[PDB]
Enzyme design. Structure first.
Site, PDB file in Angstrom:
ATOM      1  N   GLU A 166      16.860  -6.754   5.511  1.00  0.00           N
ATOM      2  CA  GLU A 166      17.356  -8.056   5.088  1.00  0.00           C
ATOM      3  C   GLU A 166      16.606  -8.496   3.826  1.00  0.00           C
ATOM      4  O   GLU A 166      15.376  -8.413   3.784  1.00  0.00           O
ATOM      5  CB  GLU A 166      17.174  -9.084   6.213  1.00  0.00           C
ATOM      6  CG  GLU A 166      17.409 -10.535   5.815  1.00  0.00           C
ATOM      7  CD  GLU A 166      16.990 -11.539   6.909  1.00  0.00           C
ATOM      8  OE1 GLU A 166      16.563 -11.119   8.018  1.00  0.00           O
ATOM      9  OE2 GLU A 166      17.083 -12.757   6.649  1.00  0.00           O
ATOM     10  N   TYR A 167      17.349  -8.945   2.809  1.00  0.00           N
ATOM     11  CA  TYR A 167      16.788  -9.456   1.547  1.00  0.00           C
ATOM     12  C   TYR A 167      16.320 -10.914   1.701  1.00  0.00           C
ATOM     13  O   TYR A 167      17.090 -11.760   2.154  1.00  0.00           O
ATOM     14  CB  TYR A 167      17.849  -9.337   0.421  1.00  0.00           C
ATOM     15  CG  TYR A 167      17.602 -10.134  -0.848  1.00  0.00           C
ATOM     16  CD1 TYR A 167      16.389 -10.072  -1.526  1.00  0.00           C
ATOM     17  CD2 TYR A 167      18.620 -10.922  -1.399  1.00  0.00           C
ATOM     18  CE1 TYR A 167      16.182 -10.804  -2.721  1.00  0.00           C
ATOM     19  CE2 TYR A 167      18.430 -11.641  -2.574  1.00  0.00           C
ATOM     20  CZ  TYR A 167      17.216 -11.582  -3.229  1.00  0.00           C
ATOM     21  OH  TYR A 167      17.048 -12.303  -4.390  1.00  0.00           O
ATOM     22  N   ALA A 168      15.064 -11.198   1.343  1.00  0.00           N
ATOM     23  CA  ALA A 168      14.536 -12.566   1.389  1.00  0.00           C
ATOM     24  C   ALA A 168      14.515 -13.155  -0.021  1.00  0.00           C
ATOM     25  O   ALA A 168      13.655 -12.805  -0.824  1.00  0.00           O
ATOM     26  CB  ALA A 168      13.133 -12.595   1.998  1.00  0.00           C
ATOM     27  N   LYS A 197       0.830  -1.200   0.000  1.00  0.00           N
ATOM     28  CA  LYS A 197       0.000   0.000   0.000  1.00  0.00           C
ATOM     29  C   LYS A 197       0.869   1.255   0.000  1.00  0.00           C
ATOM     30  O   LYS A 197       0.603   2.209  -0.739  1.00  0.00           O
ATOM     31  CB  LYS A 197      -0.939   0.006   1.208  1.00  0.00           C
ATOM     32  N   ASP A 221      -1.006  -8.167  11.742  1.00  0.00           N
ATOM     33  CA  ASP A 221      -1.158  -8.109  10.269  1.00  0.00           C
ATOM     34  C   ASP A 221      -0.458  -9.287   9.603  1.00  0.00           C
ATOM     35  O   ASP A 221       0.175  -9.149   8.546  1.00  0.00           O
ATOM     36  CB  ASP A 221      -0.630  -6.765   9.713  1.00  0.00           C
ATOM     37  CG  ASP A 221      -1.066  -6.493   8.259  1.00  0.00           C
ATOM     38  OD1 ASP A 221      -2.111  -7.046   7.823  1.00  0.00           O
ATOM     39  OD2 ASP A 221      -0.367  -5.715   7.556  1.00  0.00           O
ATOM     40  N   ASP A 229       6.989  -6.743   7.843  1.00  0.00           N
ATOM     41  CA  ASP A 229       5.963  -5.672   7.823  1.00  0.00           C
ATOM     42  C   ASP A 229       5.325  -5.440   9.196  1.00  0.00           C
ATOM     43  O   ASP A 229       4.118  -5.655   9.379  1.00  0.00           O
ATOM     44  CB  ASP A 229       4.872  -5.996   6.790  1.00  0.00           C
ATOM     45  CG  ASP A 229       3.996  -4.783   6.437  1.00  0.00           C
ATOM     46  OD1 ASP A 229       4.183  -3.698   7.028  1.00  0.00           O
ATOM     47  OD2 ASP A 229       3.114  -4.927   5.557  1.00  0.00           O
ATOM     48  N   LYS A 272      13.244  -0.527   1.060  1.00  0.00           N
ATOM     49  CA  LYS A 272      11.799  -0.259   1.080  1.00  0.00           C
ATOM     50  C   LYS A 272      11.555   1.251   1.013  1.00  0.00           C
ATOM     51  O   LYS A 272      11.890   1.972   1.947  1.00  0.00           O
ATOM     52  CB  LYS A 272      11.151  -0.862   2.339  1.00  0.00           C
ATOM     53  CG  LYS A 272       9.661  -0.554   2.535  1.00  0.00           C
ATOM     54  CD  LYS A 272       9.101  -1.342   3.730  1.00  0.00           C
ATOM     55  CE  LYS A 272       7.645  -0.965   4.049  1.00  0.00           C
ATOM     56  NZ  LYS A 272       7.015  -1.914   5.046  1.00  0.00           N
ATOM     57  N   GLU A 329       1.227 -12.225   2.255  1.00  0.00           N
ATOM     58  CA  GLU A 329       2.058 -11.257   1.527  1.00  0.00           C
ATOM     59  C   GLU A 329       3.131 -10.629   2.445  1.00  0.00           C
ATOM     60  O   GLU A 329       4.099 -10.035   1.965  1.00  0.00           O
ATOM     61  CB  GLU A 329       1.175 -10.176   0.883  1.00  0.00           C
ATOM     62  CG  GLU A 329       0.644  -9.120   1.858  1.00  0.00           C
ATOM     63  CD  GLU A 329      -0.634  -8.434   1.370  1.00  0.00           C
ATOM     64  OE1 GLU A 329      -1.546  -9.145   0.897  1.00  0.00           O
ATOM     65  OE2 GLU A 329      -0.727  -7.192   1.478  1.00  0.00           O
ATOM     66  N   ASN A 330       2.976 -10.805   3.759  1.00  0.00           N
ATOM     67  CA  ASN A 330       3.941 -10.318   4.739  1.00  0.00           C
ATOM     68  C   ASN A 330       4.810 -11.428   5.359  1.00  0.00           C
ATOM     69  O   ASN A 330       5.470 -11.208   6.384  1.00  0.00           O
ATOM     70  CB  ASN A 330       3.214  -9.559   5.863  1.00  0.00           C
ATOM     71  CG  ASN A 330       2.630  -8.241   5.396  1.00  0.00           C
ATOM     72  OD1 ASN A 330       3.060  -7.667   4.384  1.00  0.00           O
ATOM     73  ND2 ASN A 330       1.654  -7.735   6.150  1.00  0.00           N
TER      74      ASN A 330
HETATM   75  N1  LIG Z   1      13.015  -8.004   2.435  1.00  0.00           N
HETATM   76  C1  LIG Z   1      12.296  -8.366   1.343  1.00  0.00           C
HETATM   77  N2  LIG Z   1      12.734  -9.292   0.455  1.00  0.00           N
HETATM   78  C2  LIG Z   1      12.005  -9.636  -0.632  1.00  0.00           C
HETATM   79  N3  LIG Z   1      10.798  -9.101  -0.934  1.00  0.00           N
HETATM   80  C3  LIG Z   1      10.240  -8.166  -0.110  1.00  0.00           C
HETATM   81  C4  LIG Z   1      10.981  -7.745   1.090  1.00  0.00           C
HETATM   82  N4  LIG Z   1      10.223  -6.821   1.725  1.00  0.00           N
HETATM   83  C5  LIG Z   1       9.098  -6.664   0.984  1.00  0.00           C
HETATM   84  N5  LIG Z   1       9.100  -7.470  -0.102  1.00  0.00           N
HETATM   85  C6  LIG Z   1       8.012  -7.515  -1.115  1.00  0.00           C
HETATM   86  O1  LIG Z   1       7.375  -6.232  -1.167  1.00  0.00           O
HETATM   87  C7  LIG Z   1       6.018  -6.332  -0.696  1.00  0.00           C
HETATM   88  C8  LIG Z   1       5.632  -5.130   0.169  1.00  0.00           C
HETATM   89  O2  LIG Z   1       6.489  -4.988   1.307  1.00  0.00           O
HETATM   90  P1  LIG Z   1       5.870  -4.528   2.753  1.00  0.00           P
HETATM   91  O3  LIG Z   1       7.053  -4.344   3.669  1.00  0.00           O
HETATM   92  O4  LIG Z   1       4.836  -5.558   3.133  1.00  0.00           O
HETATM   93  O5  LIG Z   1       5.139  -3.137   2.394  1.00  0.00           O
HETATM   94  P2  LIG Z   1       3.734  -2.556   3.007  1.00  0.00           P
HETATM   95  O6  LIG Z   1       4.123  -2.020   4.364  1.00  0.00           O
HETATM   96  O7  LIG Z   1       3.392  -1.423   2.057  1.00  0.00           O
HETATM   97  O8  LIG Z   1       2.788  -3.744   2.960  1.00  0.00           O
HETATM   98  C9  LIG Z   1       5.953  -7.645   0.062  1.00  0.00           C
HETATM   99  O9  LIG Z   1       4.639  -8.211   0.029  1.00  0.00           O
HETATM  100  C10 LIG Z   1       6.921  -8.496  -0.729  1.00  0.00           C
HETATM  101  O10 LIG Z   1       6.239  -8.888  -1.928  1.00  0.00           O
HETATM  102 MG   LIG Z   2       3.249  -1.673   6.297  1.00  0.00          MG
HETATM  103 MG   LIG Z   3       2.819  -5.651   3.690  1.00  0.00          MG
END
Ligand SMILES: Nc1ncnc2c1ncn2[C@@H]1O[C@H](COP(=O)(O)OP(=O)(O)O)[C@@H](O)[C@H]1O
Ligand SMILES: [Mg+2]
Ligand SMILES: [Mg+2]
Ligand SMILES: O=C(Cn1cnc2ccccc21)NCCc1ccccc1
Ligand SMILES: [Cl-]
Ligand SMILES: [Cl-]
Ligand SMILES: [Cl-]
Ligand SMILES: [Cl-]
Length: 265
Positions: free
Chosen positions: A85-87, A17, A130, A148, A36, A134-135
């Protein structure tokens, strides 16, 4: 300290979002990470700076193999940047789209990892609130990592911030705007266990209004292929009354979990 000039940006990892997340490399060290990016104009309009601050404070202090590390942050005149950290194996959300459903071994293993991470959080009275696919990210060995933490808080709590998208993972007390505590995450854990085995969440419906009703009345049913053990665990987590939901230790020692999980407590 850090500035944008310190990084080379690469391919887009995902969009939230508010979060636009990119692969990045730090120039002097060649360290690879996830950057991010948030737009200050958008944070300001929604009034959610406080959520970004909670995320930074909580995820930078926590240290657990199943929780995503936050290394730091910086900002310029238009944007805020979190250094994460990269996943490298992506999200559980993507993995579920690929496979349709998880088998009992994969499901029980993920639930074990979730419960381990959450037990560490609850020991500090930190609730995530939350928890959804997706998190949940995947490490280099396929291990699950909760991310997240922007919606997280210290229990007990009320809610002061407007709800966003789907209601699918929230318990009755939360959607009805009542007081809530750690037991909110146990409800979400039951929703996930069902979605992992079946391919969709148990209260999913065509409209927000209908989804609200199914949640507040706890209206779900099982397809025939869900086994007796999985049904017992899910039915215990999805109780209307929070105090009736089990302790995380009870999830971790449930006979279906110990029979099927490939990881320990
Ligand atoms: N550290 C990470 N490594 C790989 N993909 C990520 C990572 N962080 C976020 N993502 C991708 O980006 C999307 C949004 O990140 P997020 O931190 O959940 O943002 P928001 O706070 O807007 O939901 C995640 O659903 C995932 O698809
Ligand atoms: Mg968030
Ligand atoms: Mg999220
Ligand atoms: O909000 C701040 C400084 N700030 C004050 N308390 C904080 C706690 C944690 C992190 C930063 C904090 N302004 C700079 C931009 C910013 C950076 C991070 C998150 C939100 C906004
Ligand atoms: Cl370093
Ligand atoms: Cl409150
Ligand atoms: Cl809130
Ligand atoms: Cl416990």
């Amino acid at each position: 300290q850090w500035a944008l000039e310190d990084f080379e940006i690469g391919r887009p990892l995902g969009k939230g979002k508010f979060g636009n997340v990119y692969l990045a490399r730090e120039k002097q060290s060649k360290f690879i990470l996830a950057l991010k990016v948030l737009f200050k104009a958008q944070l300001e309009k929604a009034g959610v700076e406080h959520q970004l601050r909670r995320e930074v404070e909580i995820q930078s202090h926590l240290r657990h193999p199943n929780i995503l590390r936050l290394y730091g942050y910086f900002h310029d005149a238009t944007r805020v940047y979190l250094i994460l950290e990269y996943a490298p194996l992506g999200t559980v959300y993507r993995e579920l789209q690929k496979l349709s459903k998880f088998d009992e071994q994969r499901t029980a293993t993920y639930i074990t990892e979730l419960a381990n991470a959450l037990s560490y959080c609850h020991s500090k009275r930190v609730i995530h609130r939350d928890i959804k696919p997706e998190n949940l990210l995947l490490g280099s060995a396929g291990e699950l990592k909760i991310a997240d933490f922007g919606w997280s808080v210290h229990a007990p709590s009320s809610r002061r911030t407007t709800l966003a998208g789907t209601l699918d993972y929230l318990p009755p007390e939360m959607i009805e705007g009542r007081m809530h505590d750690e037991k909110v995450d146990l409800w979400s854990l039951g929703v996930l266990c069902y979605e992992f085995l079946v391919g969709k969440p148990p209260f999913e419906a065509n409209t927000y209004q209908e989804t609200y009703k199914r949640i507040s009345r706890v209206e779900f049913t099982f397809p025939d292929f869900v086994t007796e053990g999985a049904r017992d665990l899910i039915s215990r987590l999805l109780k209307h009354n929070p105090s009736q939901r089990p302790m995380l230790r009870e999830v971790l020692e449930h006979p279906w979990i110990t029979a099927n999980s490939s990881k320990p407590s």
